[PDB]
Amino acid sequence: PAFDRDQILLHLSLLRKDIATTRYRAIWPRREDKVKAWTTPLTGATVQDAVTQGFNSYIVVGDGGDSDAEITSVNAIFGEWDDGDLAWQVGAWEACGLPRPSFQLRTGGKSIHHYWVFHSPVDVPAWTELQARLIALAGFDTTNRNPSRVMRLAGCPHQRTGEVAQIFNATGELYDPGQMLQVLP
Ligand SMILES: [Ca+2]
């Protein structure tokens, strides 16, 4: 196998997602090659094919499909800083006044990914407001704001370096969206 299946399933598990309905996106690393992204169900055979061909690996975090209109709920808010010392990125949520992430993800690239997982799926309007407030308070990359946003998948390589994305600092904690709305301005 060209990927770590345990990390893939752990990513889905921590997001309380169902592999049968999870959407995979394979994106070519070099913009100038103008290679079409794959949009397909997440399966081991498809990830195997995309990784060995040279694609980077992503999943749609929200549930329902590939476009914003197809998303009916999202199980987590999440974000990343565009840059900054990596070690600083791991802990910088604390100085922002954010609660501790449910888990974090090392991508192999320039950013740590932070996730806060809710106990129940969140409808798109409520989720959209929480995600926007999270971006504002932390100063995250403002690109990652739409309900069909894809995020780097754990257990697959960052193709530029070969480093395999890894989940770390999982706590098991689940947040409540109403409580989160109070702590996020
Ligand atoms: Ca809790």
Numbering used by the authors: 6 to 190
The article reads:
Among them, cyanophage S-2L is unique because its genome has all its adenines (A) systematically replaced by 2-aminoadenines (Z). Here, we identify the enzyme that is responsible for genome duplication of the phage S-2L, a member of the PrimPol family, and we present its crystal structure. We confirm its polymerase activity but find that the enzyme is not specific to A or Z. Instead, we propose that the absence of A in S-2L genome is explained by a separate enzyme, an HD phosphohydrolase that specifically dephosphorylates dATP and that we name DatZ. We give a structural explanation for both the specificity and the reaction mechanism of DatZ, based on three crystallographic structures, including one determined at sub-angstrom resolution.
The first region (1–190) corresponds to the AEP domain itself, with all crucial motifs conserved. Ca2+ ions were mandatory in the mother liquor to obtain crystals. As expected, the protein has a classical AEP fold. All crucial residues cluster together in the catalytic site of the domain. Y63, E85, D87, T112, K115, H118, D146, R157 are conserved across all AEPs (or have biochemically similar counterparts), and their function is well established in the superfamily. Residues E85, D87 (that can vary to Asp and Glu, respectively) coordinate a divalent metal ion (M2+) in the B site, that positions the triphosphate of the incoming nucleotide (dNTP) during polymerisation; this triphosphate is further stabilised by interactions with T112, K115, H118 and R157 (possibly varying respectively to Ser, Arg, Asn and Lys). Residue D146 along with residues E85, D87 and the dNTP’s α-phosphate coordinate another M2+ ion in the A site, making it possible to add the incoming dNTP to the primer strand of the nascent nucleic acid through the two-metal-ion mechanism. Importantly, in S-2L PP-N190 we noticed a significant positional shift of residue D87 compared to other AEP structures, along with the conservation among the close relatives of the neighbouring residue D88, which is exposed to the solvent. In all cases, the catalytic site is open to the solvent and there is no selection on the incoming nucleotides; after superposition with these structures, PP-N190 presents no structural feature that could lead to a Z vs A specificity during the polymerase reaction. Due to the presence of divalent calcium ions in all crystallisation conditions, we could not soak the crystals with nucleotides which immediately precipitate; transferring crystals to a solution devoid of Ca2+ dissolved them in a matter of seconds.
